[PDB]
Design a protein around this nucleic acid. Structure first.
Ligand SMILES: [K+]
Ligand SMILES: [K+]
Ligand SMILES: [K+]
Ligand SMILES: [Mg+2]
Ligand SMILES: [Mg+2]
Length: 126
DNA sequence: GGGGTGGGAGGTGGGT
């Protein structure tokens, strides 16, 4: 016996954007958390799923949700070079200063992973 | 194992 939250997480993990849209509409819990502390927003942000990122936020996903390592969606987008995703997160109130367990901000992670264009976007906001 | 340009049939295979 599963629930809408767990299904949402699975759909997010598998990149099934259509499935996500359905679950959202049937009222799935936007802030469900997997065993690592990832919300569906974490997974879409890491995966590069821009449209779903917008869907989740529309449905009120927590923009600054932190995982078990203190990583926010912003940290995950930054590690993967998803610039557009970064702008959308930022436009929705992402905190540029959140530090993960290692002290790193999104800025540092973006530098670490060679993502200079989104680095610049963040640099403006430090 | 590890990543999301591999896909969703798994989450008691594990991380994002
Ligand atoms: K997998
Ligand atoms: K595999
Ligand atoms: K796999
Ligand atoms: Mg992007
Ligand atoms: Mg970049």
């Amino acid at each position: 016996g599963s629930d809408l939250g767990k299904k949402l997480l699975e759909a997010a993990r598998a990149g099934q954007d259509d499935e996500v849209r359905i679950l959202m509409a049937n009222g799935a819990d936007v802030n469900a958390k997997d065993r690592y502390g990832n919300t569906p927003l974490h997974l879409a942000a890491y995966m590069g799923h821009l449209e779903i990122v917008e869907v989740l936020l529309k449905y009120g996903a927590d923009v600054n949700a932190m995982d078990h390592w203190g990583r926010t969606p912003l940290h995950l987008a930054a590690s993967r070079g998803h610039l557009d995703i970064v702008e959308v997160l930022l436009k929705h109130g992402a905190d540029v200063n959140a530090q993960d367990k290692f002290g790193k901000t999104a800025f540092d992670i973006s530098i670490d992973n060679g993502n200079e264009d989104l680095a610049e976007i963040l640099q403006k906001l430090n």
